[PDB]
Design a protein around this ligand. Structure first.
Ligand SMILES: CC(=O)N[C@H]1[C@H]([C@H](O)[C@H](O)CO)OC(C(=O)O)=C[C@@H]1NC(=N)N
Ligand SMILES: CC(=O)N[C@H]1[C@H]([C@H](O)[C@H](O)CO)OC(C(=O)O)=C[C@@H]1NC(=N)N
Ligand SMILES: CC(=O)N[C@H]1[C@H]([C@H](O)[C@H](O)CO)OC(C(=O)O)=C[C@@H]1NC(=N)N
Ligand SMILES: CC(=O)N[C@H]1[C@H]([C@H](O)[C@H](O)CO)OC(C(=O)O)=C[C@@H]1NC(=N)N
Ligand SMILES: [Ca+2]
Ligand SMILES: [Ca+2]
Ligand SMILES: [Ca+2]
Ligand SMILES: [Ca+2]
Lengths: 385, 385, 385, 385
């Protein structure tokens, strides 16, 4: 039976710790993949961590140069949530340096992009079998979510981008059924930039919060039907969501140009005209993490907010973050539960090592008591090498 | 179908060896977690060892300082009984530095406490999904069993403590159904101290035997209905159960104040007005282990007993111990079978290493012939480091 | 329910990346088998990589001399596709230095050849139980596919060879049901040489493309019914398929004698009178890999072709390659899907190491957009040793 | 449904290779248990290798002194057949320095002996739950098969010994149903010695071939009903089965006293008044292995035989060997299939290492063509240490 995706998001008060894989700490001795761009996605039965390996293990010479984003050796793999990603516990999914994945209630859909920068191809698989292919249409690093796609009523949804990372690019939404593209639409979004979208279902409608790598310190959003009829904007809150960014100030419901170049993958959950914003604590680097409840932040431009929950201290490295959801058919609830993960990047460029890898933590939205703290990576660098 | 928990404890004569994981011996070379506070719990189908990892492996630098009790990296994980806890065979359960777990016949309930000492939060999960949260009410190290909760008739029961470890603290019993707290009661127990309770079901009633860290060399007990109507006392036997303790002498059915400060997690099984006591062999340190049958020891104050079965020699390290149970729906018996595990602590503070970890052994109550021996940890310290 | 094998091959335009195991890269640190002769085969439910271990792990002294083809320690094992072959994730199949395997829709049939060069015995197993034996009939290295057998309608088919590798040998086709030989036929093929056949089903008929180690630079083929009534020939295309070989030129629908001695395991898919040829890029060594569509190449002798898709660069090592198929009962398609794997050999004789091993990549035929690239082994030799 | 055990042994011509785990070779680098006394046993669905670990891994300091037979750290564990025994692939069964195991068609029965030499206790488990206990009755190393028990019609059968290893001891047969002893009988066997019995079912009757450690160079046998009504004797063949032994000569249907002290675990399969004998090739040491068909050897005293099949060369170490069986409900045959395993011991006392461990090979009886060879351990000693 297919995930309905017809229920609204659960009301929540805060975020309870869900997982921590301690991957880098464990990899000091154990056989743990060098990875980055991890994400969590759930079915009607289980929750899995997906990740892009570098086809190499921590503390081994083949970890050399793994700051590098794209290679033929990068693979999408998955393991049960909270476990350190190892060749002994991980399922192979796809050859990929950019990925997405989601379960429709029947099978896993995985999307894996590999190939050359000027002609990359997204390979779609449904239950591990190739069901479709999407080829680069702008010949400039075809690239997708690095988090879970969204499913409603037997149809699953993703966003891909193609073109410059430093200017106007091309943005497409894709609708797939049983791993096959049945509809796509190019966004008519001049002056906007979409990348690395974190997309979730809410009462039959999909909302994505993305990365403006071009000229935005706030995050752009797209929301759409099951017919791909869409609306676009930027989160108006002056509690700026990207990294880097300016100090909190007067928002825009377009791109905030100070410190708008570059970015980091992130997410936010829309609650009416309010927003839950996950962001780094640093304005400059991928350091720290916090959840902020801003009850008029989706549409209003002020920097005032109601509630900050600490997740990672400023003195500790963070990285990418993304939404994931737990559906009624898994939880038994009457609503869709919002959750999030944070990637905890260690190594290059910030630290003197030959390698780059990430750990993960995750949290679920809860309508009971919670607490702020710091759950950092905890590895001691550098390694034996 | 839910575990009934309506049957009485099996009649037994002694204890037969059930498991030994050899974790520390194996971890000298293999990828074995640094752990402490292990415990065993069973379902209608399987038995699992739960444990608090230090988010690190034995013989690796990240094992440095693991004598330390609480950190953000500590996680509750589980593996099949008797297997060495490894990232390759362990299921992730929760982020936790204090834990409990039990199966109601349908799903695993896990309880994991993490967060700061002044505001820790117990995260409850049912089938791996968060179902409730309990926040520290005295802001002083919220802490739970470090052994299995008890289930009867689709309801599961645990004890938590909050407050000083050196004086009067606050003690609550919790009743949960499908991982959600449905009732709780604070114990009216002036001059008593409860901690690290080992709780088991017996004919619809739960009995816990706990640790008085304040001023008790004997163990306190609580027993209660499914309505949380309770009775309290201390084991009267002059065969004192805690560590440290005085020499065996004249018991109290209150706290025995000589050597009553500090303690160790332990258990006992009440059999009428008699008791099976598991305890260290040393009066001073966590060394050795023995089972003692004292047939009037629950209510009488003398130091005479009938039967001693050796489990670990005085010349070998022991540590925590706890009860676990095997229900009729798993065993096919007409009674609830009592079992116990012992944690075998190696390293700090007693030995010159940078790390602390534990192995485990376990035993089940049997109505046939058995034998005393020593089944110690067997690792040779120190390690390569 | 048995795999029907009554459907035709899917129409395709190109090849989409399916897997990459990164085995040698991972084995630099992790516990990965020294292997060669890997192959992929699927059931109605899963896809597995089969391989011949050397009964040893990479970067260990027992990897010494593993360029050697046959030993008592060689074993056939399998693991899920795309995972590095490890003692922790691999199923034991058979004692073997030559092998085949395939699933009939009910159970795995495995064929494992071990024993002395002058009297080797093929052990057939069905669901892991020995169901038959085939003994060497020419007393000179009995040897089979090193890729999947072919199944149609509850019957499975393989080819074995016995005799000289440098002249006329003896070639038999075998038909088995439930792992038991029910019919065999010796090919009447004077001046032909068959070895290491890659065999696939197409509408109830089996086609094998093989290795002429004697005097053929093009590949021989056999096709047959379920009654073992056969036809024989060589691929006529002047796009020569073997390694070594001459430059592309004027083909033969017999063996092309320039550079015809020695060879490499390979495959081709017949599409009418056209062919998809997989071959090394080098004419001399096992280097590079490419797919070539030659639309009249099965029967015509010219060297012109329509479509080249790059798979591995000339500057990188390749090795064996083979066909595998995915049936309608697994994919839900109305046709049999063609796929292929490539073995990426590292070490001896081409590189200064004490050992020889292979990685694998794989690709599936798709009727949508695809891209050429290089997905090489990526290990950096030599190893610690 | 229970294994019937009512069918006769399959007619066979020879032995086909079934498995080889390469454990010691793999353990040079990988995390492989130090073990000895392995054995294979099957259910209606799977085949598993059982083994007595030393609670330690190969090439680690805790392997020191593992020539030693009994310790508290020895555990019975199991893994799928042909896989190297690792903490990552092995199921914990029991705490044991002597063991037996067998499946009745419903669940695994395991028997594990631990405790002191003067009071050891056999712990019986059915589906991993303790169902009975058997205590030493002569207070002198209670000891059992080190191979599979035998099951017929929902009842399982084993042999245990207690007393001197250098003279008359006490020998009991045990009948169990659902892991509980329902009948036992002490053998009235003056001048006989039984130990380490290899027992198999044949048409409702159990036959065991054992080790006379006292004064027998030939093997003793017991055969019995489901009522424990028994007959006893020694294999009459002058093809002597034990190690050490004299040269082949004139047999006895009592103990052959030359070279009769000490022994090695072994087996034989009775076929009418004929026997299939598995034995070392050396008369002195545990070296080499061969299968011999002696068609009148059960009852006749001559040294002539019909058929020798080589299994391990004299120049290579062997060790224990034992029978195992595959029942009709697993294989689909109309008969019980005979199989055997050989333990390949490396290290002490014969080789200069600090440790002792064993690999395994196995073979099944087949009515088709087979071949003799040598499949030795293949590890190169000594190790890094
Ligand atoms: C496909 C690709 O290379 N994506 C990049 C991503 C990208 O460079 C920016 O979003 C600009 O478009 O940046 C980052 C990053 O850490 O900023 C990592 C991602 N790496 C990987 N997914 N491998
Ligand atoms: C939550 C916490 O830190 N609990 C402690 C426990 C505690 O200090 C005493 O019971 C006093 O309250 O003592 C010990 C101990 O070994 O004595 C270990 C436990 N460690 C862990 N559970 N991590
Ligand atoms: C059974 C056997 O030894 N087969 C050989 C194969 C063979 O030598 C040639 O085809 C000539 O007949 O060559 C090769 C090879 O790399 O060329 C490896 C195979 N190795 C293994 N399958 N182990
Ligand atoms: C229980 C016990 O210690 N059994 C011994 C066995 C025994 O010494 C002889 O049969 C004499 O009775 O000998 C041997 C042996 O290698 O000869 C190993 C067995 N070791 C183990 N099963 N651990
Ligand atoms: Ca930006
Ligand atoms: Ca105390
Ligand atoms: Ca050739
Ligand atoms: Ca003897």
């Amino acid at each position: 039976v297919k995930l309905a995706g017809n229920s609204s998001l659960c009301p929540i008060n805060g975020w309870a710790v869900y997982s921590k894989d301690n991957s880098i700490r464990i990899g000091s001795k154990g056989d743990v993949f060098v990875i980055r761009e991890p994400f969590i996605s759930c079915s009607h039965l289980e929750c899995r961590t997906f990740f892009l390996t570098q086809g190499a293990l921590l503390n081994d010479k083949h970890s050399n140069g793994t700051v590098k984003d794209r290679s033929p050796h990068r693979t999408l793999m998955s393991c049960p949530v909270g476990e350190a990603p190892s060749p002994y516990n991980s399922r192979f999914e796809s050859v990929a340096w950019s990925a997405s994945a989601c379960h429709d209630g029947t099978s896993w859909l995985t999307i894996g992009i590999s190939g050359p920068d000027n002609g990359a191809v997204a390979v779609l698989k449904y239950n591990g079998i190739i069901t479709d292919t999407i080829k680069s249409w702008r010949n400039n690093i075809l690239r997708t979510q690095e988090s879970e796609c969204a499913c409603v009523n037997g149809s699953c949804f993703t966003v891909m981008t193609d073109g410059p990372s430093n200017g106007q690019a091309s943005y497409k939404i894709f609708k797939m059924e049983k791993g096959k593209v049945v509809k796509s639409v190019e966004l008519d979004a001049p002056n906007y930039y979409y990348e690395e979208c974190s997309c979730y279902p809410n009462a039959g409608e999909i909302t994505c919060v993305c990365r403006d790598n071009w000229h935005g310190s706030n995050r752009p959003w797209v929301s759409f039907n099951q017919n791909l009829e869409y609306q676009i904007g930027y989160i108006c809150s002056g509690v700026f969501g990207d990294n880097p960014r300016p100090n909190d100030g007067t928002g825009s419901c377009g791109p905030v140009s100070s410190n708008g170049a570059y970015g980091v993958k992130g997410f936010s959950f829309k609650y009416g005209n309010g927003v839950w914003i996950g962001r780094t604590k640093s304005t400059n680097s991928r350091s720290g993490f916090e959840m902020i409840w801003d009850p008029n932040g989706w549409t209003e431009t002020d920097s005032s907010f109601s509630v900050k929950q600490d997740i990672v201290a400023i003195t500790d490295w963070s990285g990418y973050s993304g939404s994931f959801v737990q559906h009624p058919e898994l939880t038994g609830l009457d609503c869709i539960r919002p959750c999030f993960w944070v990637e905890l990047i260690r190594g290059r460029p910030k630290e003197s090592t030959i390698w780059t890898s990430g750990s993960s933590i995750s949290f679920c939205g809860v309508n009971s008591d919670t607490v702020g703290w710091s759950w950092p990576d905890g590895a001691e660098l550098p390694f034996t090498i």
